[PDB]
Write a protein that binds this DNA or RNA. Structure first.
Ligand SMILES: Nc1ncnc2c1ncn2[C@@H]1O[C@H](COP(=O)(O)OP(=O)(O)O)[C@@H](O)[C@H]1O
Ligand code: ALF
Ligand SMILES: [Mg+2]
Ligand SMILES: [Mg+2]
Ligand SMILES: [Zn+2]
Length: 670
RNA sequence: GGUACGUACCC
RNA sequence: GGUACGUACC
C-alpha cells in the first residue's frame, strides 16, 4: 500500500511547510496522503503536535483504524469523540499525544474552555489536518476555529500551525457564473489560509484510470394515477379550514410551502393567544405531514403518523377535530391497505433492487434518504415486500445522532456496528441519511441510490463517491419533471464550473492571489467584529426583570428573564426556588446514551395548569434544576410578544450559572 | 431531552 | 425575517 504518484505530488507543498488544500477525487486516498504528511512533519522537528478534525462521529474511528494507527510504530495517537469524552479532560489527552483525532466541535469546546485542565490554544499544535474542508465557510465549527486563526494571524501572532485541508469538492457556493465560482474558491482559500491548492496535474492519467467513476442513470417515476388516500386527507384539511372561519387560508395542501404558512399561523396564534386558531393549525400540520409521508413512502406509514396523533389524547375545538378524524379513520386505513394505489417511488425502488440484488446478494448498496423516519420506513417496506423476500437482502438503517419525536438517533457504537457488518457483507444494503454521504469508505460498495433528494452539488458528488467499487452504478430516483431532477442536472454542470474555477485559481499570478487573500481575510475579521457588536446590541435592549415567559399553550406567566441562568453556555435553567409551583414532573427518569461530566437528566416537566411540555430536570451534581426549552414559550418584553426558536436572539442578557453561589443562597432558607 | 450550526425551501 | 430537515456538541 505504498503512496501513488498523484498522492506524493498532491502533498509536495505540505511537505515543504506550506498551507495547502489537497484536491483529489472521492476515494483517491486523501487520508493516506495526510498520514504521510503527518509522519514527515513529526519526524522533522521535536515536540510537534497534530490535530486531525472530522465532521461526523464515525470518521474518527474509521480514520484511526484504517490509516492513522500506522503512526503508532513511533508516535502516540489518540482518538476523542463525544461518547468517550466525559472520562478525560481534552487538554491533558492532546498534550500527552503526538496526534489527536477528533470531531471539530470537541476541539472548539477545548479552545473556549475556562478550566485549566481542558483548555487548549491553537499554538499547542504545529499542524492541523481538516477533513472535508469545504465545510470551512460561514459559521460552521470548522470556520469558527479558522476565523480565530485568521484574527491571530492578522494581529501578528507567530507559531500558528500549518493547515492541511482535504476535499474532493470545494463547491461553487450557490454561484452559477465563472466569476462567482472563482470568487467562492478564493473565499475558501482565504478561510483556510491556503498558499497552494495542490492536485494531480502531472499524474492526471494514472488518477483517471484507477479511481473509477460510477455509471449514472436517472430512474424517473410518475405521479400516482389514483391517490384516494391523499385526496381524502385533502378533503379533511378543507373541512377543518372552513370551521376556522378565516379568509386567505392557504390551499396548496401536501407541500413544504403550506407547512411553512400553517406553522407561521400557529406562531401568530400563540403570540396573540387565539387558542382556537392555534389548535386547528397544529392539527392541520399533522395532516400535512401525512401527505408528505404519503408522497415519499407507503400510505400506511402516513396513516400511522396520523392515527398515533389522535390516539394519544374535552374542549369544543379538539372535540370537533377528534370527531372529524374518527369519521374518516376506518376508510383511510382500508385505502392504505389497497395495493392498487401503490407509491411509484417504491415500485421503482423495487425494480432497481430486484435487478441488482440478483444473484441474491453480490451487490453492496446504500440508498440515501433525507429523513431518519423515511429510512426506517423504507426498511419496513423492504421487509414487508414479497417480490424481494426470496432474494437475500440483509438491510439496516444508518443515521447520525440527530433526534426528535418522529425518529430517534443512533449513537457512535450503534452506527459503528452497522458500518462494520456492511463493510464485508454481513449486511449488504443500507438505508442512510446524509450522515454517510461523505468520508465513509466501503471498498466493495457498488451501488448508490439517491431517493428524491434536493441537495447542492457537493452532496451529490460526495454521495456518489461512496460507491468505491469497479463497475459501480449511481441512480437518481426521483419524480419526472420535478425540481429535484432539474437541480441534479444543474449540479452536474456546477461540478464542471467548480473544476474550471479551481484551475483558474491555481494558474493565477502569485502576487495577484496573495493580495486577494489578504483582502478577503481582512473583510472576514471585520465582518465578524461588526456582526458580534450587532448581536450584543440586541442582547442588551431590555432589563431581564422586564421580560416575562408565558406558556405557549395556555399563555399563563411562568417566570422572568432574571430567573434564567446558562449551564455550559447552552442549558437555560430557572434558579428561582418557587418555580416548582408552576411546573409538574410528568415522567419517570430519562436515560441517555451519552453521559456527561457534571450532570445527568432527571424527569420531563410540564406546565402545571395545561400540561404543555416545557423541558427537563438536570441533576447537576447535588442539586436538581429545571431546564427550559425556548420553543415552549412566548416571550413578552416591553416592545412585543414573540415565540423564539433560538436563545441567541433574545433581547435581554443571561448570566452563566454558578453552582457555588446557588448552593449558598438555597442553603440559607431551610 | 437541551444547544448550535449547515443544507433545502419561502419571503 | 421565517419554515423544514439533517448533523455535531452537551
Ligand atoms: N497508496 C494506496 N494504495 C492502496 N490503497 C490506498 C492507497 N491510498 C489509499 N488507499 C485506500 O483507498 C481507499 C480510499 O481512501 P480514502 O482516504 O477513504 O479516500 P478519500 O480521498 O475520499 O478520503 C481506502 O480504502 C484507502 O485505504
Ligand atoms: F473524498 Al472522500 F472519503 F474524503 F470520498
Ligand atoms: Mg428536541
Ligand atoms: Mg475521505
Ligand atoms: Zn400552560
Amino acid at each position: 500500500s505504498e503512496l501513488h504518484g498523484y498522492q506524493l505530488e498532491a502533498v509536495a507543498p505540505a511537505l515543504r511547510g506550506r498551507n495547502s488544500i489537497v484536491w483529489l477525487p472521492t476515494g483517491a486516498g486523501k487520508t493516506r496522503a495526510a498520514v504521510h504528511v503527518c509522519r514527515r512533519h513529526l519526524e522533522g522537528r521535536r515536540g510537534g503536535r497534530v490535530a486531525v478534525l472530522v465532521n461526523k462521529v464515525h470518521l474518527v474511528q474509521q480514520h484511526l483504524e484504517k490509516e492513522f494507527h500506522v503512526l503508532r510504530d513511533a508516535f502516540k495517537v489518540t482518538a476523542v469523540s463525544g461518547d468517550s469524552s466525559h472520562k478525560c479532560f481534552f487538554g491533558q489527552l492532546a498534550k500527552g499525544s503526538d496526534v489527536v483525532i477528533c470531531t471539530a466541535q470537541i476541539l472548539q469546546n477545548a479552545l473556549l474552555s475556562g478550566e485549566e485542565e481542558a483548555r487548549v490554544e491553537l499554538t499547542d499544535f504545529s499542524l492541523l489536518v481538516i477533513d472535508e474542508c469545504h465545510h470551512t465557510q460561514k459559521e460552521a465549527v470548522y470556520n469558527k476555529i479558522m476565523l480565530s486563526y485568521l484574527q491571530k494571524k492578522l494581529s501578528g501572532q507567530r507559531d500558528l500551525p500549518q493547515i492541511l485541508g482535504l476535499t474532493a469538492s470545494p463547491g461553487t457556493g450557490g454561484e452559477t457564473s465563472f466569476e462567482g465560482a472563482v470568487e467562492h474558491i478564493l473565499q475558501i482559500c482565504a478561510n483556510l489560509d491556503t498558499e497552494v491548492i495542490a492536485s494531480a496535474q502531472e499524474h492526471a492519467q494514472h488518477l483517471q484510470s484507477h479511481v473509477p467513476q460510477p455509471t449514472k442513470q436517472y430512474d424517473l417515476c410518475q405521479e400516482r394515477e389514483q391517490d384516494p388516500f391523499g385526496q381524502r386527507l385533502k378533503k379533511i384539511m378543507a373541512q377543518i379550514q372552513e370551521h376556522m372561519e378565516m379568509p386567505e387560508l392557504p390551499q396548496n395542501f401536501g407541500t413544504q410551502v403550506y407547512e411553512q404558512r400553517i406553522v407561521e399561523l400557529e406562531n401568530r396564534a400563540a403570540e396573540r393567544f387565539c387558542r382556537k386558531t392555534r389548535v386547528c393549525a397544529l392539527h392541520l400540520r399533522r395532516y400535512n405531514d401525512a401527505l408528505l409521508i404519503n408522497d415519499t413512502v407507503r400510505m400506511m406509514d402516513a396513516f400511522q403518523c396520523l392515527q398515533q396523533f389522535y390516539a394519544d389524547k374535552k374542549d369544543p375545538t379538539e372535540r370537533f377535530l377528534a370527531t372529524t378524524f374518527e369519521e374518516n379513520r376506518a376508510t383511510l386505513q382500508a385505502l392504505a391497505g389497497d395495493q392498487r394505489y401503490e407509491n411509484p417511488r417504491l415500485s421503482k425502488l423495487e425494480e432497481i433492487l430486484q435487478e441488482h440484488f440478483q444473484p441474491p446478494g453480490s451487490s453492496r448498496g446504500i440508498v440515501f434518504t433525507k429523513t431518519r423516519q423515511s429510512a426506517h420506513s423504507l426498511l419496513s417496506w423492504l421487509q414487508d415486500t414479497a417480490g424481494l423476500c426470496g432474494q437475500h437482502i440483509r438491510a439496516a438503517v444508518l443515521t447520525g445522532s440527530g433526534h426528535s419525536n418522529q425518529a430517534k438517533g443512533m449513537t457512535q457504537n450503534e452506527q459503528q456496528d452497522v458500518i462494520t457488518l456492511f463493510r464485508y457483507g454481513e449486511l449488504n444494503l443500507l438505508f442512510s441519511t446524509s450522515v454517510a454521504e461523505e468520508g465513509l469508505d466501503i471498498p466493495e460498495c457498488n451501488i448508490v441510490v439517491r431517493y428524491g433528494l434536493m441537495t447542492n452539488e457537493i452532496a451529490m458528488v460526495q454521495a456518489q463517491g461512496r460507491a468505491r467499487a469497479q463497475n459501480s452504478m449511481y441512480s437518481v430516483l426521483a419524480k419526472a419533471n420535478s425540481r429535484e431532477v432539474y437541480r441534479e442536472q444543474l449540479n452536474e454542470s456546477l461540478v464542471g464550473l467548480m473544476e474550471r474555477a479551481i484551475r483558474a485559481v491555481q494558474a493565477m499570478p502569485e502576487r495577484k492571489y496573495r493580495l486577494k487573500i489578504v483582502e478577503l481575510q481582512r473583510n472576514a475579521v471585520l465582518s465578524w467584529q461588526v456582526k458580534e457588536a450587532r448581536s450584543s446590541e440586541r442582547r442588551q435592549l431590555h432589563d431581564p426583570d422586564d421580560v416575562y415567559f408565558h406558556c405557549v399553550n395556555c399563555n399563563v406567566a411562568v417566570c422572568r428573564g432574571s430567573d434564567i441562568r446558562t449551564v455550559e453556555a447552552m442549558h437555560h435553567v430557572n434558579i428561582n426556588p418557587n418555580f416548582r409551583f408552576y411546573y409538574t414532573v410528568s415522567s419517570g427518569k430519562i436515560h441517555f446514551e451519552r453521559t456527561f461530566r457534571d450532570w445527568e437528566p432527571g424527569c420531563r416537566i410540564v406546565c402545571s395548569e395545561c400540561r404543555q411540555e416545557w423541558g427537563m430536570e438536570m441533576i447537576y451534581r447535588n442539586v436538581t434544576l429545571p431546564i427550559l426549552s425556548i420553543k415552549n414559550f412566548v416571550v413578552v418584553t416591553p416592545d412585543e410578544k414573540k415565540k423564539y426558536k433560538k436563545w441567541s436572539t433574545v433581547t435581554f442578557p443571561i448570566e452563566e450559572f454558578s453552582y457555588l453561589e446557588y448552593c449558598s443562597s438555597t442553603q440559607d432558607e431551610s
